[PDB]
Amino acid sequence: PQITLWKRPLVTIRIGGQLKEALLDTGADDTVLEEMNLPGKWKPKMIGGIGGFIKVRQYDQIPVEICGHKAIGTVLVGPTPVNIIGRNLLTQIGCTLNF
Amino acid sequence: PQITLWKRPLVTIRIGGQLKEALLDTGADDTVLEEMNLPGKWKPKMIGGIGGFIKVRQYDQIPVEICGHKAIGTVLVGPTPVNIIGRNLLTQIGCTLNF
Numbered sequence: 184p185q186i187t188l189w190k191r192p193l194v195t196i197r198i199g200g201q202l203k204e205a206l207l208d209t210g211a212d213d214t215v216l217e218e219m220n221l222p223g224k225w226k227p228k229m230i231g232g233i234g235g236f237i238k239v240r241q242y243d244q245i246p247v248e249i250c251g252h253k254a255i256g257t258v259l260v261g262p263t264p265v266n267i268i269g270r271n272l273l274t275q276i277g278c279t280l281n282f
Numbered sequence: 283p284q285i286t287l288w289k290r291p292l293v294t295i296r297i298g299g300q301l302k303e304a305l306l307d308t309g310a311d312d313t314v315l316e317e318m319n320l321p322g323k324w325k326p327k328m329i330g331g332i333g334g335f336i337k338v339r340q341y342d343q344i345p346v347e348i349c350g351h352k353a354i355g356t357v358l359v360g361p362t363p364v365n366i367i368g369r370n371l372l373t374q375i376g377c378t379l380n381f
């Protein structure tokens with residue numbers, strides 16, 4: 184699909200057996216999801232945005248479906264106001280910026 | 283052009299007669315530049331990201347050339363690690379996300 188930027192580029196994702204709304208974010212190195220209790224080992228990490236750093240849990244090799252396109256990679260989980268799909272997954276579905 | 287996302291989508295912009303590198307950011311509502319002087323009256327504003335809120339200077343109706351494409355719009359200036367081009371200007375240059 185082609186997604187215009189008149190509104191926030193929110194799409195449906197599937198993860199851990201839940202459907203969620205997430206922002207397709209070319210300004211994000213990493214994928215950061217709202218708090219959820221995924222199974223498996225994780226590692227602590229601190230990630231920084233505009234207002235400073237937050238503590239997140241890093242989970243590896245989590246399958247994520249983005250608009251019916253399959254992806255698998257690292258997901259960070261923590262106190263974010265919005266679910267963010269970053270470049271680590273956007274590359275996997277062949278996402279480009281075009282103008 | 284078509285820009286892939288295996289690296290950060292940094293492009294050269296021209297603003298106030300100066301050249302700067304900036305991130306094309308579909309997850310940003312607003313355009314936020316590192317601290318710099320711009321001509322004209324500004325008003326204090328607050329904007330929020332991950333890590334919380336920051337105070338910025340809001341400048342209205344600033345021309346910005348993004349990879350040779352002209353935009354004129356609101357530019358915020360404040361403490362950011364990277365220059366961010368957000369949706370307010372991305373829409374002006376006809377930028378879309380495609381996969």
Ligand SMILES: COC(=O)N[C@H](C(=O)N[C@@H](Cc1ccccc1)[C@@H](O)CN(Cc1ccc(-c2ccccn2)cc1)NC(=O)[C@@H](NC(=O)OC)C(C)(C)C)C(C)(C)C
Nearest residue numbers: 210211212213230231232233309310311312330331332363
């Ligand atoms: C209405 O809210 C917004 O649109 N808020 C904004 C914002 O922070 N956007 C976020 C996504 C977002 C939206 C709304 C609420 C919370 C978060 C991103 O589009 C841009 N942001 C802007 C940003 C980009 C880079 C950096 C940075 C950090 C360390 C070293 C180099 N750069 C910091 C902030 N990037 C990041 O925060 C990412 N950071 C990142 O990839 O760090 C490398 C995360 C996500 C992985 C944390 C702006 C201030 C830019 C307008």
